[PDB]
Design a protein around this ligand. Structure first.
Ligand code: HEM
Length: 148
């Protein structure tokens, strides 16, 4: 489908350097919602500043995991069911770590922000809309983790 192609094609560029692009995503995320910072608790320690997170190997590893889940959604765009059980569990895991379902809308905004800045002129409003649909679909699946 044309919309599925809009997603695939846009993802191609940022998929080539996932850590660099995911770093933009998480920098934007903390700027928008600073209270997400303390939810990373590697070695039982809290990051004081957002820039502290960027020196942490485990935090950077987590960026790679996020970008790989998104890549999975892109491979399955139009095939989004295939991932429902995995997303529900991933959702439950985040509830357990203390992320509120609401904070995932901020994640969506950060993903769209990162795509916009990476695509520039290529970020057509059809692509913003398509990604909004895809992300909306990911979030619904995700949400089931919170039991509603
Ligand atoms: C609100 C933003 C988020 C916070 C605060 C957050 C926090 C965490 C924490 C603390 C862990 C466990 C430690 C670790 O594995 O490094 C984790 C695991 C993980 N997260 Fe995130 N996360 C966030 C968003 C996301 C998003 C958007 C994705 C993917 C779309 C994602 C994918 C993962 C994956 C794949 C794991 C491994 C889970 C497992 O199998 O154990 N997270 N999350």
């Amino acid at each position: 489908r044309p919309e599925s192609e809009l997603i695939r094609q846009s993802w191609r560029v940022v998929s080539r350097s996932p850590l660099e692009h995911g770093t933009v995503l998480f920098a934007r995320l903390f700027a928008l919602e600073p209270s997400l910072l303390p939810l990373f608790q590697y070695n039982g320690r809290q990051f004081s500043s957002p820039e502290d997170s960027l020196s942490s190997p485990e935090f950077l590893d987590h960026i790679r995991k996020v970008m790989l889940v998104i890549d999975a959604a892109v491979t399955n765009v139009e095939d989004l069911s295939s991932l429902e059980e995995y997303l529900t569990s991933l959702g439950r895991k985040h509830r357990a770590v203390g992320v509120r379902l609401s904070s995932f809308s901020t994640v969506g905004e950060s993903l769209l922000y990162m795509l916009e800045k990476s695509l520039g002129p290529d970020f057509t409003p059809a692509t913003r809309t398509a990604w909004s649909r895809l992300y909306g679909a990911v979030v619904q699946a995700w949400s089931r983790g919170w039991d509603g």
